[PDB]
Amino acid sequence: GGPEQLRRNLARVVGKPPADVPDDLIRASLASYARYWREAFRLPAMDHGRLGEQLDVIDIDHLWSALDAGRGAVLALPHSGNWDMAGVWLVQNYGPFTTVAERLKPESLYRRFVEYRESLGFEVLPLTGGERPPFEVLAERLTDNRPICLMAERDLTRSGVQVDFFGEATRMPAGPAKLAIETGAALFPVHCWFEGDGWGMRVYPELDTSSGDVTAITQALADRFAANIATYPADWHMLQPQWIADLSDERRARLG
Ligand SMILES: CCCCCCCCCCCCCCCC(=O)O
Ligand code: NA
């Protein structure tokens, strides 16, 4: 949707009509969006070792004090900062992990993204066109006392979970919640942002998976995403539609 959609999105973040959203914020947000791509270019050619040592993660102990307990862990994060760089870090401070990526078309484009994220040292599973359901694999990883990483703030389909996000209705994936209730693994919200010419990363307290309510779980995970985004409102570079009302009557029919 571009800058116009980004504008309409930041509007919900700072409680403002889109036209009145501060321009310095918009400038910062687009600069972050541009930075992600500029970094994706060089990232495979950088020294992942130096980045493993130099960069850090606030309250990472949450993750360590769960894998050492043999549970496995769900690392659920929004599209903020550079999530690909945070992946590199984990590879260098744990090892290869498993995530999923929406299968793009053309396949030539998808094959370019896999070749990129494989050059960073982790495993991506497509949501379609697999020898198995990705959910099946991820569950077996969590059972093998391992961590997974999942983009968890946007899933605009019939499978999506109707949650409130900055006081408006959107839909987020249930994957993080189901895999957590099932394997009993720890569900950790995670946030990434840009910190000067560097990178910021933080792991947050695990959520209550007891109730079994996927809805209230995903909701609490959105309330955490929201608070973190409002803390770094220029790092959440979402240029695609997020909220339902920003969709056409056509694209909204697609989700029932
Ligand atoms: C602080 C803990 C570290 C966690 C590291 C998170 C790694 C996330 C990488 C997953 C990539 C998923 C790509 C799908 C998103 C897209 O391209 O639209
Ligand atoms: Na202006």
Author numbering: 48 to 303
What do the study's own words say?
Here, X-ray crystallography, site-directed mutagenesis and enzymatic activity data are used to define the three-dimensional structure, acceptor/donor substrate binding, membrane binding and catalytic mechanism of PatA from M. smegmatis. PatA catalyses an essential step in the biosynthesis of PIMs in M. tuberculosis. The enzyme transfers a palmitoyl moiety from palmitoyl–CoA to the 6-position of the Manp ring linked to 2-position of myo-inositol in PIM1 or PIM2. Our results reveal that the enzyme has an α/β architecture and shares with other important eukaryotic/prokaryotic acyltransferases an acid/base catalytic mechanism involving conserved histidine and aspartic/glutamic acid residues.
Two other crystal forms were obtained in P 21 (PatA–C16-2) and P 42212 (PatA–C16-3) space groups, and the corresponding crystal structures solved at 2.90 and 2.43 Å resolution, respectively, by using molecular replacement methods. The high quality of the electron density maps allowed the trace of residues 41 to 302 (PatA–C16-1), 48 to 295 (PatA–C16-2) and 48 to 303 (PatA–C16-3). We have decided to use the PatA–C16-1 crystal form for our description since it displays the highest resolution. A close inspection of the three crystal structures revealed that the protein crystallized as a monomer, displaying a high degree of structural flexibility in the N- and C-terminal regions (coloured in green in Supplementary Fig. 3; root-mean-square deviation (r.m.s.d.) value of 1.6 and 8.4 Å for Cα atoms in 41–47 and 288–302 residue ranges for the N and C terminus, respectively). Strikingly, one molecule of palmitic acid was unambiguously identified in the difference electron density maps of PatA–C16-1, PatA–C16-2 and PatA–C16-3 crystal structures. We believe that acyl molecule is associated to the enzyme due to the hydrolysis of palmitoyl–CoA during the isolation and purification of PatA from M. smegmatis mc2155. The acyl chain is deeply buried into the hydrophobic pocket, and oriented with the carboxylate group facing the groove and the acyl tail extending into the globular core of the monomer. Interestingly, the comparison of the three crystal structures revealed conformational flexibility in the carboxylate moiety of the palmitate, located in close proximity with the lateral chain of H126. In all crystal structures of palmitoyl–PatA and PatA–S-C16CoA complexes, the carboxylate OE2 oxygen atom of E200 was found at 2.8 Å of the ND1 nitrogen atom of the aromatic imidazole ring of the invariant H126. It is worth noting that when the individual palmitate molecules observed in the three crystal structures of palmitoyl–PatA were superimposed, they showed important structural flexibility at the carboxylate region, suggesting that the carboxylate group is not in a catalytically competent position in the crystal structures.
